[PDB]
Amino acid sequence: VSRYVPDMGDLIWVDFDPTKGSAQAGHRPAVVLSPFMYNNKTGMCLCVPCTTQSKGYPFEVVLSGQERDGVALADQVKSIAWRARGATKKGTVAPEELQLIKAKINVLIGLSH
Amino acid sequence: VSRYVPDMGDLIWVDFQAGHRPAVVLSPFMYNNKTGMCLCVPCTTQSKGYPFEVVLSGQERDGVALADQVKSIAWRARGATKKGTVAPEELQLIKAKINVLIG
């Protein structure tokens, strides 16, 4: 058995506990921003929190789901010890959604712009 | 009295015994002030040649910023204080390494 390794664009549950089921009351999922190679080597990844509680704040990025919608909180990027904390895959964000999250971070930090 | 609001490029002490660690602030004052949060990378004196280390040269003690370990931090509620400011070329470098981890 090999542990799941988070890949760029993946929507993951962090701190997964098999006792609150598919809902995970009290948790946020997260969009993975960093590449597989980095994630695999370090046991860490860069990711942004998600929530269904949209407020329409400037750094929100709408995640359009089949199931329902939510937002990535793009300003709140964090380095996460996925391997140590136990991550599971919930889904994958669309290419456009990932692009938009990165664009907003780029604005906030000022990287290429 | 107004609490110190971190600003882009500042080197701060933060709760990241309470115990603090130095961090470079990567988000602009306007954002930091409005949200009570800021983006920052942790610093260490212990260099190891590691790929995402950026050298920070002071006038006393030296170390590196660990550029890959970006963290959104509630400065407002954790008592960030200002210790200094990184040089522009140092901040630019930290941003280059992050840009690598993110398209």
Side-chain angles (χ1 to χ4, degrees), chain A residues 11-21 23-52 54-89:
Chain A
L11 192 60
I12 64 177
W13 285 114
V14 202
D15 311 287
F16 192 86
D17 140 76
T19 50
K20 297 168 318 307
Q24 300 296 284
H27 289 35
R28 294 146 127 199
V31 180
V32 178
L33 296 183
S34 49
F36 184 95
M37 182 175 272
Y38 174 89
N39 307 339
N40 193 37
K41 262 57 184 296
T42 65
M44 307 184 82
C45 60
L46 285 181
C47 67
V48 290
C50 298
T51 174
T52 59
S54 174
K55 285 180 303 176
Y57 291 5
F59 291 99
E60 291 182 12
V61 175
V62 169
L63 300 181
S64 272
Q66 353 167 331
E67 60 266 57
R68 62 192 304 182
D69 297 348
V71 293
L73 305 188
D75 55 318
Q76 292 176 243
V77 44
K78 62 193 169 176
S79 172
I80 284 296
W82 67 264
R83 190 180 268 122
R85 283 159 75 161
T88 68
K89 189 169 159 184

Coordinates of all heavy atoms in Angstrom, one line a residue, chain A residues 11-89, unseen atoms left out:
Chain A
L11 N -8.0 18.8 -4.6 CA -8.7 19.2 -3.4 C -8.6 18.1 -2.4 O -9.0 17.0 -2.6 CB -10.2 19.4 -3.8 CG -11.1 20.1 -2.7 CD1 -10.5 21.6 -2.4 CD2 -12.5 20.2 -3.1
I12 N -8.0 18.5 -1.2 CA -7.8 17.5 -0.2 C -8.4 17.7 1.1 O -8.8 18.9 1.4 CB -6.2 17.3 0.0 CG1 -5.6 18.6 0.5 CG2 -5.5 16.8 -1.3 CD1 -4.1 18.5 0.9
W13 N -8.7 16.7 1.9 CA -9.0 16.8 3.3 C -7.7 16.7 4.1 O -6.9 15.8 3.9 CB -9.9 15.7 3.8 CG -11.4 15.8 3.4 CD1 -12.0 15.0 2.6 CD2 -12.3 16.8 3.8 NE1 -13.3 15.4 2.4 CE2 -13.5 16.5 3.2 CE3 -12.2 17.9 4.7 CZ2 -14.7 17.3 3.4 CZ3 -13.4 18.7 4.8 CH2 -14.6 18.4 4.2
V14 N -7.4 17.7 5.0 CA -6.3 17.6 5.9 C -6.8 17.1 7.2 O -7.9 17.3 7.6 CB -5.5 18.9 6.0 CG1 -4.1 18.7 6.5 CG2 -5.6 19.7 4.7
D15 N -5.9 16.5 8.0 CA -6.3 15.9 9.3 C -7.5 15.0 9.2 O -8.5 15.2 10.0 CB -6.6 17.0 10.3 CG -5.5 18.1 10.4 OD1 -4.5 17.8 11.0 OD2 -5.8 19.2 9.9
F16 N -7.5 14.1 8.2 CA -8.7 13.2 8.0 C -8.9 12.2 9.2 O -7.9 11.5 9.6 CB -8.7 12.5 6.7 CG -10.0 11.8 6.4 CD1 -11.0 12.5 5.7 CD2 -10.2 10.5 6.7 CE1 -12.2 11.9 5.4 CE2 -11.4 9.8 6.4 CZ -12.4 10.5 5.8
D17 N -10.1 12.2 9.7 CA -10.4 11.3 10.8 C -11.6 10.5 10.3 O -12.7 11.0 9.9 CB -10.7 12.1 12.1 CG -11.9 11.6 12.8 OD1 -11.8 10.6 13.5 OD2 -12.9 12.3 12.8
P18 N -11.5 9.2 10.3 CA -12.5 8.3 9.7 C -13.7 8.1 10.6 O -14.5 7.1 10.5 CB -11.7 6.9 9.6 CG -10.6 7.0 10.6 CD -10.2 8.5 10.7
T19 N -14.0 9.1 11.5 CA -15.1 9.0 12.4 C -16.1 10.2 12.3 O -17.2 10.1 12.9 CB -14.6 8.9 13.9 OG1 -13.6 9.9 14.2 CG2 -14.0 7.5 14.1
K20 N -15.9 11.1 11.4 CA -16.9 12.1 11.1 C -17.4 12.0 9.6 O -18.1 12.9 9.1 CB -16.4 13.6 11.3 CG -16.1 13.9 12.8 CD -15.4 15.2 12.9 CE -14.3 15.3 11.8 NZ -13.4 14.1 11.8
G21 N -16.9 10.9 9.0 CA -17.4 10.5 7.7 C -17.1 11.5 6.5 O -16.1 12.2 6.5
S22 N -18.0 11.5 5.5 CA -17.8 12.2 4.3 C -17.9 13.8 4.5 O -17.4 14.6 3.7 CB -18.9 11.8 3.2
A23 N -18.5 14.1 5.7 CA -18.8 15.5 6.0 C -17.6 16.2 6.6 O -17.2 17.4 6.3 CB -20.0 15.7 6.9
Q24 N -16.9 15.6 7.6 CA -15.8 16.1 8.3 C -16.2 17.5 9.0 O -15.6 18.5 8.7 CB -14.6 16.3 7.4 CG -14.1 15.1 6.8 CD -13.5 14.1 7.8 OE1 -12.4 14.3 8.3 NE2 -14.3 13.0 8.1
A25 N -17.2 17.4 9.8 CA -17.7 18.6 10.5 C -16.5 19.3 11.3 O -15.9 18.6 12.1 CB -18.9 18.3 11.4
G26 N -16.3 20.5 11.1 CA -15.2 21.2 11.8 C -13.9 21.4 11.0 O -13.0 22.1 11.4
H27 N -13.9 20.8 9.8 CA -12.7 20.8 8.9 C -12.9 21.7 7.7 O -14.1 21.9 7.2 CB -12.3 19.4 8.5 CG -11.7 18.6 9.6 ND1 -12.1 18.7 10.9 CD2 -10.7 17.7 9.6 CE1 -11.4 17.9 11.7 NE2 -10.6 17.3 10.9
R28 N -11.8 22.1 7.1 CA -11.9 22.7 5.7 C -11.1 21.7 4.8 O -10.1 21.1 5.2 CB -11.2 24.1 5.7 CG -11.9 25.1 6.5 CD -10.9 26.1 7.1 NE -11.2 27.5 6.8 CZ -10.3 28.5 6.9 NH1 -9.0 28.2 7.3 NH2 -10.6 29.7 6.6
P29 N -11.6 21.6 3.5 CA -10.7 21.0 2.5 C -9.7 22.1 2.0 O -9.8 23.3 2.5 CB -11.7 20.7 1.4 CG -12.8 21.7 1.6 CD -12.9 21.9 3.0
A30 N -8.7 21.7 1.2 CA -7.7 22.6 0.8 C -7.3 22.3 -0.7 O -7.3 21.2 -1.1 CB -6.5 22.5 1.7
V31 N -7.1 23.4 -1.5 CA -6.5 23.2 -2.8 C -5.0 23.1 -2.8 O -4.4 24.0 -2.3 CB -7.0 24.3 -3.8 CG1 -6.5 24.0 -5.2 CG2 -8.5 24.3 -3.8
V32 N -4.4 22.1 -3.4 CA -3.0 22.0 -3.4 C -2.3 22.8 -4.6 O -2.8 22.8 -5.7 CB -2.5 20.5 -3.5 CG1 -1.0 20.3 -3.6 CG2 -3.0 19.7 -2.3
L33 N -1.3 23.6 -4.3 CA -0.8 24.5 -5.2 C 0.6 24.1 -5.7 O 1.0 24.5 -6.8 CB -0.6 25.9 -4.6 CG -1.9 26.7 -4.2 CD1 -1.5 28.1 -3.7 CD2 -2.9 26.8 -5.3
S34 N 1.3 23.4 -4.9 CA 2.7 23.0 -5.2 C 2.8 21.7 -6.0 O 1.8 20.8 -6.0 CB 3.5 22.9 -3.9 OG 2.8 22.1 -3.0
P35 N 3.9 21.5 -6.7 CA 4.0 20.3 -7.6 C 4.3 19.0 -6.8 O 4.9 18.9 -5.8 CB 5.2 20.6 -8.5 CG 5.9 21.7 -7.8 CD 4.9 22.5 -7.0
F36 N 3.8 17.9 -7.4 CA 4.0 16.5 -6.9 C 5.4 16.3 -6.4 O 5.6 15.8 -5.3 CB 3.7 15.5 -8.0 CG 3.8 14.1 -7.5 CD1 2.7 13.4 -7.1 CD2 5.1 13.4 -7.6 CE1 2.9 12.0 -6.6 CE2 5.2 12.1 -7.1 CZ 4.1 11.4 -6.6
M37 N 6.4 16.6 -7.2 CA 7.8 16.3 -6.8 C 8.2 17.0 -5.5 O 8.7 16.3 -4.6 CB 8.8 16.9 -7.9 CG 10.3 16.6 -7.6 SD 11.3 17.1 -9.0 CE 11.3 15.6 -10.0
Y38 N 7.8 18.3 -5.3 CA 8.0 18.9 -4.1 C 7.3 18.3 -3.0 O 7.8 17.9 -1.9 CB 7.7 20.4 -4.2 CG 7.7 21.1 -2.9 CD1 8.9 21.8 -2.5 CD2 6.6 21.2 -2.0 CE1 9.0 22.4 -1.3 CE2 6.7 21.8 -0.8 CZ 7.9 22.5 -0.4 OH 7.9 23.1 0.8
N39 N 6.0 18.1 -3.2 CA 5.1 17.5 -2.1 C 5.6 16.1 -1.7 O 5.7 15.8 -0.5 CB 3.7 17.3 -2.6 CG 3.1 18.6 -3.1 OD1 3.6 19.7 -2.8 ND2 2.1 18.6 -4.0
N40 N 6.1 15.3 -2.7 CA 6.6 14.0 -2.4 C 7.9 14.0 -1.6 O 8.0 13.3 -0.6 CB 6.7 13.2 -3.7 CG 7.0 11.7 -3.5 OD1 6.4 11.1 -2.6 ND2 7.8 11.1 -4.3
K41 N 8.8 14.8 -2.0 CA 10.1 14.9 -1.4 C 10.1 15.4 0.1 O 10.7 14.8 1.0 CB 11.0 15.8 -2.2 CG 12.0 15.2 -3.1 CD 11.3 14.3 -4.1 CE 12.3 13.5 -5.0 NZ 13.1 14.4 -5.9
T42 N 9.2 16.4 0.3 CA 9.3 17.1 1.6 C 8.2 16.6 2.6 O 8.3 16.8 3.8 CB 9.0 18.6 1.4 OG1 7.7 18.9 0.9 CG2 10.1 19.2 0.4
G43 N 7.2 16.0 2.1 CA 6.0 15.6 2.9 C 5.3 16.9 3.3 O 4.4 16.9 4.2
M44 N 5.5 18.0 2.6 CA 4.8 19.2 2.8 C 4.2 19.7 1.4 O 4.6 19.2 0.4 CB 5.7 20.4 3.2 CG 6.6 20.1 4.5 SD 7.5 21.5 5.0 CE 6.3 22.4 5.9
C45 N 3.2 20.6 1.5 CA 2.7 21.2 0.3 C 2.1 22.6 0.6 O 1.7 22.9 1.7 CB 1.6 20.3 -0.3 SG 0.1 20.0 0.8
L46 N 2.1 23.4 -0.4 CA 1.4 24.7 -0.4 C 0.0 24.6 -0.8 O -0.3 24.0 -1.9 CB 2.2 25.8 -1.2 CG 3.5 26.3 -0.6 CD1 4.1 27.3 -1.4 CD2 3.2 26.8 0.8
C47 N -1.0 25.1 0.0 CA -2.4 24.9 -0.3 C -3.2 26.0 0.3 O -2.8 26.8 1.1 CB -2.9 23.6 0.2 SG -2.8 23.5 2.0
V48 N -4.4 26.2 -0.2 CA -5.3 27.2 0.3 C -6.6 26.6 0.9 O -7.1 25.7 0.3 CB -5.7 28.2 -0.8 CG1 -4.5 29.1 -1.2 CG2 -6.2 27.6 -2.0
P49 N -7.0 27.1 2.0 CA -8.3 26.7 2.6 C -9.5 26.9 1.8 O -9.5 27.9 1.0 CB -8.4 27.5 3.9 CG -7.5 28.7 3.7 CD -6.4 28.3 2.7
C50 N -10.5 26.0 1.9 CA -11.8 26.2 1.2 C -12.9 26.2 2.2 O -12.7 25.7 3.3 CB -12.0 25.1 0.1 SG -10.8 25.1 -1.2
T51 N -14.0 26.9 1.8 CA -15.2 26.9 2.7 C -16.4 27.1 1.8 O -16.3 27.6 0.7 CB -15.2 27.9 3.8 OG1 -16.4 28.0 4.5 CG2 -14.9 29.3 3.2
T52 N -17.6 26.6 2.3 CA -18.9 26.9 1.6 C -19.4 28.2 2.0 O -20.4 28.7 1.4 CB -20.0 25.8 1.9 OG1 -20.2 25.8 3.3 CG2 -19.5 24.4 1.4
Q53 N -18.9 28.8 3.1 CA -19.3 30.1 3.6 C -18.7 31.3 2.8 O -17.8 31.9 3.3 CB -19.0 30.3 5.1 CG -19.7 29.3 6.0 CD -19.3 29.5 7.5
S54 N -19.3 31.5 1.6 CA -18.8 32.7 0.8 C -19.2 34.0 1.4 O -20.4 34.2 1.8 CB -19.4 32.5 -0.6 OG -19.1 33.7 -1.4
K55 N -18.3 34.9 1.4 CA -18.6 36.3 1.9 C -18.4 37.3 0.7 O -18.9 38.4 0.8 CB -17.7 36.7 3.1 CG -18.2 36.0 4.4 CD -17.4 36.4 5.5 CE -15.9 36.0 5.3 NZ -15.0 36.5 6.4
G56 N -17.7 36.9 -0.3 CA -17.6 37.8 -1.5 C -16.4 38.7 -1.3 O -16.3 39.7 -2.0
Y57 N -15.5 38.3 -0.4 CA -14.2 39.1 -0.2 C -13.3 39.0 -1.3 O -13.4 38.0 -2.1 CB -13.5 38.6 1.1 CG -14.3 38.9 2.4 CD1 -15.6 39.5 2.3 CD2 -13.8 38.6 3.6 CE1 -16.3 39.8 3.5 CE2 -14.5 38.9 4.8 CZ -15.7 39.5 4.7 OH -16.4 39.8 5.8
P58 N -12.4 40.0 -1.5 CA -11.6 40.1 -2.7 C -10.7 38.9 -3.1 O -10.5 38.7 -4.3 CB -10.7 41.3 -2.4 CG -11.4 42.1 -1.3 CD -12.2 41.1 -0.5
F59 N -10.3 38.1 -2.2 CA -9.4 37.0 -2.5 C -10.1 35.6 -2.5 O -9.4 34.6 -2.7 CB -8.2 37.0 -1.6 CG -7.3 38.2 -1.8 CD1 -7.4 39.3 -1.0 CD2 -6.5 38.2 -2.9 CE1 -6.6 40.4 -1.3 CE2 -5.6 39.3 -3.2 CZ -5.7 40.4 -2.4
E60 N -11.4 35.6 -2.4 CA -12.2 34.4 -2.7 C -12.2 34.0 -4.2 O -12.2 34.9 -5.1 CB -13.6 34.6 -2.2 CG -13.8 34.7 -0.7 CD -15.2 34.9 -0.2 OE1 -16.2 34.7 -1.0 OE2 -15.4 35.2 1.0
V61 N -12.0 32.7 -4.4 CA -12.2 32.2 -5.8 C -13.3 31.2 -5.8 O -13.2 30.2 -5.1 CB -10.9 31.6 -6.3 CG1 -11.0 31.0 -7.7 CG2 -9.8 32.7 -6.3
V62 N -14.3 31.4 -6.6 CA -15.5 30.5 -6.6 C -15.0 29.1 -7.2 O -14.4 29.0 -8.2 CB -16.6 31.1 -7.5 CG1 -17.7 30.0 -7.8 CG2 -17.3 32.2 -6.8
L63 N -15.4 28.1 -6.4 CA -15.2 26.7 -6.9 C -16.5 26.2 -7.3 O -17.4 26.1 -6.5 CB -14.5 25.9 -5.8 CG -13.1 26.3 -5.2 CD1 -12.6 25.4 -4.2 CD2 -12.1 26.5 -6.4
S64 N -16.7 25.9 -8.6 CA -18.0 25.5 -9.1 C -18.1 24.0 -9.1 O -17.5 23.3 -10.0 CB -18.2 26.0 -10.5 OG -18.8 27.3 -10.5
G65 N -18.9 23.4 -8.2 CA -19.1 22.0 -8.1 C -20.3 21.4 -8.7 O -21.4 22.1 -8.9
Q66 N -20.3 20.2 -9.1 CA -21.4 19.4 -9.6 C -22.4 19.3 -8.4 O -23.6 19.5 -8.5 CB -21.0 18.0 -10.0 CG -19.4 17.9 -10.0 CD -19.0 16.4 -10.1 OE1 -19.6 15.5 -9.6 NE2 -17.8 16.2 -10.6
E67 N -21.8 19.0 -7.2 CA -22.5 18.8 -6.0 C -23.1 20.1 -5.4 O -24.3 20.2 -5.1 CB -21.5 18.2 -5.0 CG -20.2 19.0 -4.7 CD -19.0 18.6 -5.5 OE1 -19.0 18.7 -6.8 OE2 -17.9 18.3 -4.9
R68 N -22.2 21.1 -5.3 CA -22.5 22.4 -4.8 C -21.3 23.3 -5.1 O -20.3 22.9 -5.6 CB -22.8 22.3 -3.3 CG -21.5 21.9 -2.5 CD -21.9 21.6 -1.0 NE -22.5 22.7 -0.3 CZ -22.9 22.6 0.9 NH1 -22.7 21.6 1.7 NH2 -23.5 23.7 1.5
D69 N -21.5 24.6 -4.7 CA -20.3 25.5 -4.9 C -19.6 25.8 -3.6 O -20.2 25.5 -2.5 CB -20.8 26.8 -5.6 CG -21.3 26.6 -7.1 OD1 -21.1 25.4 -7.6 OD2 -21.9 27.5 -7.6
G70 N -18.4 26.4 -3.7 CA -17.7 26.9 -2.5 C -16.7 27.9 -3.0 O -16.6 28.3 -4.1
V71 N -15.8 28.4 -2.0 CA -14.7 29.2 -2.4 C -13.4 28.8 -1.8 O -13.3 28.2 -0.7 CB -15.0 30.7 -2.0 CG1 -16.1 31.3 -2.8 CG2 -15.2 30.9 -0.5
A72 N -12.3 29.0 -2.6 CA -10.9 28.9 -2.2 C -10.6 30.3 -1.6 O -10.8 31.3 -2.2 CB -10.0 28.6 -3.3
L73 N -10.0 30.3 -0.4 CA -9.6 31.5 0.3 C -8.1 31.8 -0.2 O -7.2 31.4 0.6 CB -9.7 31.4 1.8 CG -11.1 31.1 2.3 CD1 -11.2 31.2 3.8 CD2 -12.1 32.0 1.6
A74 N -8.0 32.4 -1.3 CA -6.7 32.5 -2.0 C -5.6 33.2 -1.2 O -4.4 32.9 -1.3 CB -6.8 33.1 -3.4
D75 N -5.9 34.2 -0.4 CA -5.0 35.0 0.4 C -4.4 34.1 1.5 O -3.3 34.5 2.1 CB -5.7 36.2 1.0 CG -6.9 35.8 1.8 OD1 -7.7 35.0 1.4 OD2 -7.1 36.4 2.9
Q76 N -5.0 33.0 1.9 CA -4.6 32.3 3.1 C -3.8 31.0 2.8 O -4.0 30.0 3.4 CB -5.8 31.9 3.8 CG -6.5 33.2 4.4 CD -7.8 32.9 5.1 OE1 -8.8 33.4 4.7 NE2 -7.7 32.1 6.2
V77 N -2.9 31.2 1.8 CA -2.0 30.1 1.5 C -1.1 29.7 2.6 O -0.6 30.6 3.4 CB -1.2 30.4 0.2 CG1 -0.7 31.8 0.2 CG2 -0.1 29.4 0.0
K78 N -0.9 28.4 2.8 CA -0.1 27.9 4.0 C 0.6 26.7 3.6 O 0.2 25.9 2.7 CB -1.1 27.6 5.2 CG -2.1 26.5 4.8 CD -3.2 26.4 5.8 CE -4.4 25.5 5.2 NZ -5.5 25.2 6.2
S79 N 1.8 26.5 4.2 CA 2.6 25.3 4.0 C 2.1 24.3 5.0 O 2.0 24.5 6.2 CB 4.1 25.6 4.3 OG 4.8 24.4 4.3
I80 N 1.8 23.1 4.5 CA 1.1 22.1 5.3 C 1.9 20.8 5.3 O 2.4 20.3 4.3 CB -0.3 21.8 4.8 CG1 -1.3 23.0 5.2 CG2 -0.9 20.5 5.2 CD1 -1.5 23.1 6.7
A81 N 2.0 20.1 6.5 CA 2.7 18.8 6.6 C 1.7 17.7 6.2 O 1.3 17.0 7.1 CB 3.3 18.6 8.0
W82 N 1.4 17.6 5.0 CA 0.4 16.6 4.5 C 0.7 15.2 5.0 O -0.2 14.4 5.4 CB 0.1 16.7 3.0 CG 1.3 16.2 2.2 CD1 2.2 17.0 1.6 CD2 1.6 14.9 1.9 NE1 3.2 16.2 1.0 CE2 2.8 14.9 1.1 CE3 1.0 13.7 2.1 CZ2 3.4 13.8 0.6 CZ3 1.6 12.5 1.7 CH2 2.8 12.6 0.9
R83 N 2.0 14.8 4.8 CA 2.4 13.4 5.1 C 2.2 13.1 6.6 O 1.8 12.1 7.0 CB 3.8 13.1 4.7 CG 4.2 11.6 4.7 CD 5.6 11.4 4.2 NE 5.6 11.0 2.8 CZ 6.4 11.7 1.9 NH1 7.1 12.7 2.3 NH2 6.3 11.4 0.6
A84 N 2.7 14.1 7.5 CA 2.6 13.9 8.9 C 1.1 14.0 9.4 O 0.8 13.4 10.4 CB 3.5 15.0 9.6
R85 N 0.3 14.8 8.8 CA -1.1 15.0 9.3 C -2.1 14.1 8.6 O -3.2 14.0 9.2 CB -1.5 16.5 9.1 CG -0.8 17.4 10.1 CD -0.8 18.9 9.6 NE -2.1 19.5 9.7 CZ -2.3 20.8 9.6 NH1 -1.3 21.7 9.6 NH2 -3.6 21.3 9.7
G86 N -1.7 13.4 7.5 CA -2.6 12.5 6.9 C -3.6 13.2 6.0 O -4.6 13.8 6.4
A87 N -3.4 13.2 4.7 CA -4.2 13.9 3.7 C -5.0 12.8 2.8 O -4.4 11.8 2.5 CB -3.5 14.8 2.8
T88 N -6.2 13.1 2.5 CA -7.0 12.3 1.6 C -7.6 13.1 0.4 O -7.9 14.3 0.6 CB -8.1 11.4 2.2 OG1 -9.2 12.3 2.7 CG2 -7.6 10.6 3.4
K89 N -7.7 12.5 -0.8 CA -8.2 13.2 -1.9 C -9.7 13.2 -2.0 O -10.4 12.2 -2.0 CB -7.6 12.7 -3.2 CG -7.9 13.5 -4.4 CD -7.0 13.1 -5.6 CE -7.6 13.5 -6.9 NZ -6.8 13.0 -8.1

